[PDB]
Amino acid sequence: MASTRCKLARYLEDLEDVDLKKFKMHLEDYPPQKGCIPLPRGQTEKADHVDLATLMIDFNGEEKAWAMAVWIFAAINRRDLYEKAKRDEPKWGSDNARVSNPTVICQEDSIEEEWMGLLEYLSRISICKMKKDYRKKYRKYVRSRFQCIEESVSLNKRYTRLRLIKEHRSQSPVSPIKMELLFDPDDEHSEPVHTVVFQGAAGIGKTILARKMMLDWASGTLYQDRFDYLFYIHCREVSLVTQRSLGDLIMSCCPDPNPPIHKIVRKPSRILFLMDGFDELQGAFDEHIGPLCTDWQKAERGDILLSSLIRKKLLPEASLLITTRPVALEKLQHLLDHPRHVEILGFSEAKRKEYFFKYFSDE
Amino acid sequence: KKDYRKKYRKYVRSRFQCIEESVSLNKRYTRLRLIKEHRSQSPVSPIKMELLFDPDDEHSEPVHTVVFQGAAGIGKTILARKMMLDWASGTLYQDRFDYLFYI
Amino acid sequence: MASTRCKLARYLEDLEDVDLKKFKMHLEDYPPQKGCIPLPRGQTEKADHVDLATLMIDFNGEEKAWAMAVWIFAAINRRDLYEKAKRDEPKWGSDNARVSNPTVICQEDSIEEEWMGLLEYLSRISIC
Amino acid sequence: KKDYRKKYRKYVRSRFQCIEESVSLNKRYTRLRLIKEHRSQSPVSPIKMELLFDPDDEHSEPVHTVVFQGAAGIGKTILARKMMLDWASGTLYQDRFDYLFYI
Numbered sequence: 001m002a003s004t005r006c007k008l009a010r011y012l013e014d015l016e017d018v019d020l021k022k023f024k025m026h027l028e029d030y031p032p033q034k035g036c037i038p039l040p041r042g043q044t045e046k047a048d049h050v051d052l053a054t055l056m057i058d059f060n061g062e063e064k065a066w067a068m069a070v071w072i073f074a075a076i077n078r079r080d081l082y083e084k085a086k087r088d089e090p091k092w093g094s095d096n097a098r099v100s101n102p103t104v105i106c107q108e109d110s111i112e113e114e115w116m117g118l119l120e121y122l123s124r125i126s127i128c129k130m131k132k133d134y135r136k137k138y139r140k141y142v143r144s145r146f147q148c149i150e151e152s153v154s155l156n157k158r159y160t161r162l163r164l165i166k167e168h169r170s171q172s173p174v175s176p177i178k179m180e181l182l183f184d185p186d187d188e189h190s191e192p193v194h195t196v197v198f199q200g201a202a203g204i205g206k207t208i209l210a211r212k213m214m215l216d217w218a219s220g221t222l223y224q225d226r227f228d229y230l231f232y233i234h235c236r237e238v239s240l241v242t243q244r245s246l247g248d249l250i251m252s253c254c255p256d257p258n259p260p261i262h263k264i265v266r267k268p269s270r271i272l273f274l275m276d277g278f279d280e281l282q283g284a285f286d287e288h289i290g291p292l293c294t295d296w297q298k299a300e301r302g303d304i305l306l307s308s309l310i311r312k313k314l315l316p317e318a319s320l321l322i323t324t325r326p327v328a329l330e331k332l333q334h335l336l337d338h339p340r341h342v343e344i345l346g347f348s349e350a351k352r353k354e355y356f357f358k359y360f361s362d363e
Numbered sequence: 364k365k366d367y368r369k370k371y372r373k374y375v376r377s378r379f380q381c382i383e384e385s386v387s388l389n390k391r392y393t394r395l396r397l398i399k400e401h402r403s404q405s406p407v408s409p410i411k412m413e414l415l416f417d418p419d420d421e422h423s424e425p426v427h428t429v430v431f432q433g434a435a436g437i438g439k440t441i442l443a444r445k446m447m448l449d450w451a452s453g454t455l456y457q458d459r460f461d462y463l464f465y466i
Numbered sequence: 467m468a469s470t471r472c473k474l475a476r477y478l479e480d481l482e483d484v485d486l487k488k489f490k491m492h493l494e495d496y497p498p499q500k501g502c503i504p505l506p507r508g509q510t511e512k513a514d515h516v517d518l519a520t521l522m523i524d525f526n527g528e529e530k531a532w533a534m535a536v537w538i539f540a541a542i543n544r545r546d547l548y549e550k551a552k553r554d555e556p557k558w559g560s561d562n563a564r565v566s567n568p569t570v571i572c573q574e575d576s577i578e579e580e581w582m583g584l585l586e587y588l589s590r591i592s593i594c
Numbered sequence: 595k596k597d598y599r600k601k602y603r604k605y606v607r608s609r610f611q612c613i614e615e616s617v618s619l620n621k622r623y624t625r626l627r628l629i630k631e632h633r634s635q636s637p638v639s640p641i642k643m644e645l646l647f648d649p650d651d652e653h654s655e656p657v658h659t660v661v662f663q664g665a666a667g668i669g670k671t672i673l674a675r676k677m678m679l680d681w682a683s684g685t686l687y688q689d690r691f692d693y694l695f696y697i
């Protein structure tokens with residue numbers, strides 16, 4: 001009963017020659033954002049099976065070495081060894097002494113996929129690092145501000161897959177791109193594109209759509225999970241001469257007593273601002289106002305802050321979504337280039353009845 | 364996986380015993396006859412418990428429907444309770460199959 | 467000037483151990499220039515200086531093996547080795563190899579047939 | 595494996611001592627003579643403790659039966675208690691063998 005190094009050596013002894021060569025490449029070339037360290041080519045190539053297991057533990061420690069072995073097994077299509085290592089990770093845990101009262105924890109619950117997953121995050125120091133603290137909080141917070149009055153108590157039940165004919169380039173493919181990859185361009189085309197705009201008549205529901213679009217992705221919900229953050233901002237509160245910074249604008253969404261904005265200032269183009277209603281903007285607004293803004297934290301004028309944000313000169317990679325009234329387009333269209341115009345339409349004949357299916361309680 | 368398993372198993376297991384005659388069931392097993400209709404247009408293959416759902420070589424991998432024909436009072440109601448009781452502890456039954464639903 | 471392998475082996479000896487590790491990594495990761503095939507990781511790491519020079523010649527040929535070394539020396543920043551490789555251009559004759567049955571990439575390959583006898587008669591005049 | 599081991603060992607160990615003459619047994623060992631009948635149709639191989647069950651080169655790997663012949667009062671009853679007491683602590687005895695059953 002020694003295992004670990006010996007358990008790993010046993011799987012490695014099951015690799016065919018071709019499999020071993022590839023397993024070793026992967027070790028030597030291990031992808032660099034796991035909290036894992038690749039292994040040197042000399043020692044790796046030279047190592048027999050038991051020595052390779054020892055080398056993996058010496059370089060990365062037990063738990064990471066095991067994770068690396070599992071990933072590589074999948075990668076070289078040895079799914080047998082992938083499933084065997086996955087089922088025999090806390091399998092020596094069953095053959096472990098109770099030691100009477102648990103000094104910290106019994107540790108019996110490690111086979112559970114959620115618990116194994118927790119252990120995988122736990123010792124990551126990179127996946128564990130602060131990723132977890134940044135995620136769950138933001139998600140649940142953005143989620144609980146749109147329900148539970150004691151009519152706005154159910155929203156997804158009131159969905160409809162509202163029409164989304166996205167303006168084909170104004171000088172035939174369908175590509176409705178309603179939710180999945182709506183921001184994404186066609187083949188290449190424009191990878192760093194960030195601006196999308198929705199055109200709909202007054203009262204269509206473009207204000208409703210943003211609340212729904214938030215509510216969808218505010219649980220992951222197979223939405224753009226490859227995108228990290230979304231920022232809802234309706235311009236009812238936003239006004240002129242406010243002289244408030246983006247952080248003040250940001251903290252408006254979630255008033256954190258300890259604003260982590262220094263960590264929100266991370267990975268541009270990984271964060272999306274959902275601006276809502278240009279019509280809501282009340283007051284004068286020069287689309288080409290003289291003074292220019294580039295400072296993120298400076299207390300700047302409300303329209304000026306938007307001016308930089310709309311021009312994206314501040315936060316050059318930040319994505320933007322702007323529900324706009326068609327009549328007010330010429331102001332922003334002259335202001336900003338390459339806008340992903342999206343025409344949104346109301347319910348059809350049958351859909352109108354289907355709305356009453358959502359609404360009414362009796363035939 | 365652990366939370367999905369142990370619970371379902373013990374639950375499906377404790378609804379068929381411990382009155383204070385239905386207190387022992389596996390003791391009342393018998394390996395009841397199981398001649399599975401050969402295709403209606405010789406191999407034995409009783410397939411009583413192991414791979415009873417499984418076809419022959421390939422044949423039909425995604426097959427899902429099996430039906431038992433027996434006279435009224437044979438014990439087909441009893442068999443399901445036994446077949447549940449068998450696999451409700453793994454018991455070297457189709458452990459390569461995850462869940463069973465008695466109705 | 468009979469063997470380029472020996473000259474390549476001497477240059478491998480000149481390489482520092484860190485430079486040799488970089489040289490092995492570069493040989494394994496060699497880019498596709500002049501139809502040159504990169505050495506497999508296991509062979510490069512296990513081979514000593516003499517063996518690696520032989521393996522470089524066996525993999526592509528003496529001329530390509532020397533050319534790969536000159537590029538690798540520049541890549542590993544071994545300027546003295548890179549200058550020496552540019553300074554010395556060995557003759558492409560060949561070193562001693564235990565290829566009694568000749569082998570070529572084509573399926574037909576080569577044999578110990580009449581070709582050998584003809585080559586021997588052509589190169590062997592006085593001894594016999 | 596751990597739950598099966600320690601328990602069995604200490605248990606088989608504490609039933610042969612500590613009265614308040616049978617209080618020391620290994621001290622009363624002696625390496626008693628063990629001439630194992632050569633096949634009844636010269637090698638020494640006393641095989642007193644190590645590989646006493648083990649055959650010669652191959653010969654009979656799955657052999658299981660060994661029998662001790664001794665006069666009445668020799669100590670064959672004592673030997674089993676000692677042989678248990680030896681291996682009941684591993685004691686570089688047949689640790690490649692898992693369990694022993696005294697009866």
Ligand SMILES: CC(C)(O)c1coc(S(=O)(=O)NC(=O)Nc2c3c(cc4c2CCC4)CCC3)c1
Nearest residue numbers: 199200201202203204205279324325326327328
């Ligand atoms: C094409 C053009 C210029 O006429 C146009 C495009 O969008 C607008 S708008 O003014 O901003 N939005 C609306 O008018 N919405 C609306 C409509 C009707 C009735 C009602 C509403 C709102 C509640 C009642 C009839 C059709 C449009 C105008």
Ligand SMILES: CC(C)(O)c1coc(S(=O)(=O)NC(=O)Nc2c3c(cc4c2CCC4)CCC3)c1
Nearest residue numbers: 400430431432433434435436437438439440441
């Ligand atoms: C072949 C055909 C059509 O006759 C047939 C096939 O299955 C049935 S059935 O009606 O549904 N089941 C029974 O009849 N079971 C039964 C039988 C006997 C006695 C008793 C019972 C139940 C308790 C007493 C004698 C043989 C059958 C009919």
Ligand SMILES: CC(C)(O)c1coc(S(=O)(=O)NC(=O)Nc2c3c(cc4c2CCC4)CCC3)c1
Nearest residue numbers: 631661662663664665666667668669670671672
């Ligand atoms: C060879 C044959 C047939 O005579 C034989 C082989 O073993 C036995 S036996 O009967 O079962 N065992 C004994 O007799 N033990 C014994 C002996 C002596 C004295 C005493 C004892 C027991 C205490 C006193 C003298 C020699 C033997 C008989």
Ligand SMILES: Nc1ncnc2c1ncn2[C@@H]1O[C@H](COP(=O)(O)OP(=O)(O)O)[C@@H](O)[C@H]1O
Nearest residue numbers: 158159160162200201202203204205206207208
């Ligand atoms: N998808 C939808 N399902 C049901 N009702 C909707 C939907 N979209 C909009 N509405 C209706 O529109 C009203 C709000 O419209 P709003 O979002 O303000 O349109 P706009 O933003 O174009 O003015 C709500 O009363 C709601 O009943």
Ligand SMILES: Nc1ncnc2c1ncn2[C@@H]1O[C@H](COP(=O)(O)OP(=O)(O)O)[C@@H](O)[C@H]1O
Nearest residue numbers: 391392393395433434435436437438439440441
């Ligand atoms: N394998 C069996 N062993 C003992 N008794 C059985 C067995 N199968 C059925 N029985 C008897 O049959 C009765 C229930 O039969 P049931 O399952 O209702 O048959 P069916 O479902 O064909 O009507 C029970 O009283 C039981 O005693």
Ligand SMILES: Nc1ncnc2c1ncn2[C@@H]1O[C@H](COP(=O)(O)OP(=O)(O)O)[C@@H](O)[C@H]1O
Nearest residue numbers: 622623624626664665666667668669670671672
């Ligand atoms: N190895 C030994 N050392 C000391 N005394 C022994 C030994 N073997 C047997 N005896 C003595 O023999 C007696 C028990 O003999 P027993 O094992 O019953 O022989 P058998 O089993 O042949 O009848 C004890 O009183 C003990 O003193």
